């Protein structure tokens, strides 16, 4: 199983299909795919867990990566059985996701708390509880409740995409702290990021 708050499962939330790959609601996929490339973790088809998953070494630690292929609002139908089968406690899970309540170029590491209206997190918290870690990738304010769908399923303009990409790059540099269980120092170093 997992060991204490050494992160050993990193989930990226998003929707499958080329038509969703560049949308804001796939920010978690972007992070996890970049992380996988950084450390040479193969992301391969995982039909038993309704996902694409990988396993490999990050900085001396055995870590699994998971992209649910369920569609966003059914993400728990991948995350929950995956984490149960491998006996990964929530305290050893990091879930990367788009955050409507933060600006593009803002990124934060959070432990615990609610879904904040996120329809992927809403499918996960009921089953494993709230005590997993989150990489909240700011995607900006949607401007109204009605324009939320159009915002998260939007492809960001290049300025906003640059701001998100720089924040995600910063977070990739701090995963070494997370897999080593240095969650407080990672929180300090991630949350301090500024784009300019
Ligand atoms: Cl969705
Ligand atoms: Cl936060
Ligand atoms: Cl969160």
Which residues define the annotated binding site for cytidine? 73, 119
Partnered with residue 138 across adjacent β-strands are 99
Burial class (CB in 10 A: 0-12, 13-18, 19+), 45: exposed
The answer to whether 65 and 10 have CB atoms below 8 angstroms apart is: yes
d(CA 59, CA 122): 31
In contact, 33 and 12? CB cutoff 8 Å: yes
Q: Which residues surround ligand 2, an ion (CB under 5 A)?
A: 108, 110
> For the domain that residue 90 is a member of, what is the CATH number?
3.40.50.1470
Cα separation, 170 vs 159, whole angstroms? 17
Is 118 known to be catalytic?
Answer: no
Give the method of determination: X-ray
- Rounded Cα distance, 156 and 138, in Å: 12
Q: Could you give the C-alpha distances from 181 to 130, 152, 177, in angstroms and in order?
A: 18, 31, 6
Minimum-distance ligand to the CA of 28? 3
Q: Which of 3, 25, 97, 170 is catalytic?
A: 25
Give the chain's largest Cα–Cα span.
Answer: 46
Q: List the resolution, Å.
A: 1.3
CB 21 within 8 A of CB 29: yes
CA of 167 to the centre of ligand 1 (A): 22
Instruction: Compute the distance from residue 149 Cα to the ligand 1 centre, in Å.
Output: 8
- Cα–Cα distances in Å, from 104 out to 67, 123, 138? 22, 24, 5
Q: How far is Cα 140 from Cα 16, in angstroms, rounded to an integer?
A: 22
**Sequence-distant (≥ 6) Cβ neighbours of residue 102 within 8 angstroms:** 108, 136, 137, 138, 139, 140
The beta-carbon contacts of 37-41 under 8 Å, at least 24 apart in sequence, are 38/172, 39/63, 41/65
Query: For the purposes of burial, counting CB atoms within 10 Å of the CB of 115, is it exposed (0-12), middle (13-18) or buried (19 or more)?
Result: middle
CB 137 within 8 A of CB 96: yes
Please state the domain count of the chain. 1
Ligand nearest to the CA of 119: 1
Q: Which residues are annotated as a binding site?
A: 20, 71, 73, 119
Q: Which listed ligand is nearest to 117 at the C-alpha?
A: 3
Q: What is the 3 state secondary structure string of the chain?
A: CCCCCCCCEEEECCCCCCCCCCCHHHHHHHHHHHHHHHHCCCCEEEHHHCEEEEEEEECCEEEEEEEECCCHHHCHHHHHHHHHHCCCCHHHEEEEEEECCCCCCCEEEEECCCCCCCCCHHHCHHHHCCCCEEEEEECCCCCCCCCHHHHHCCCCCHHHHHHHHHHHHHHHHHHHHHHCCCHHHHHHHHHCCCCC
Which parts are annotated binding residues for tRNA?
Answer: 20, 71, 73, 119
Give the span between the Cα atoms of 164 and 104, in whole angstroms.
5
Domain that holds residue 134: 1-196
């Amino acid at each position: 199983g997992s060991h204490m708050s050494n992160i050993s499962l990193i989930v990226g939330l998003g929707n499958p299909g080329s038509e969703y790959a560049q949308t804001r609601h796939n920010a978690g996929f972007w992070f996890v795919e970049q992380l996988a490339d950084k450390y040479g973790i193969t992301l391969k088809n995982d039909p038993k867990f309704h996902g694409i998953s990988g396993r490999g070494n990050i900085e001396g630690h055995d870590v699994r990566l998971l992209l649910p292929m369920t569609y966003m609002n059914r993400s728990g139908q991948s995350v929950v059985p995956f984490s149960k089968f491998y006996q990964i406690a929530p305290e050893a899970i990091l879930i990367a996701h788009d955050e409507l309540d933060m600006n593009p170029g803002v990124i934060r590491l959070k432990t615990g708390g609610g879904h904040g209206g996120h329809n992927g997190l809403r499918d996960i918290v009921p089953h494993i509880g709230p005590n997993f870690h989150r990489l909240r990738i700011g995607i900006g304010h949607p401007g109204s409740k009605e324009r939320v769908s159009g915002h998260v399923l939007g492809k960001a303009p290049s300025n906003e995409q640059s701001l998100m990409d720089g924040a995600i790059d910063h977070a990739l540099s701090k995963v070494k702290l997370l897999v080593q269980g240095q969650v407080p120092q990672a929180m300090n170093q991630i949350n301090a990021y500024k784009p300019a």
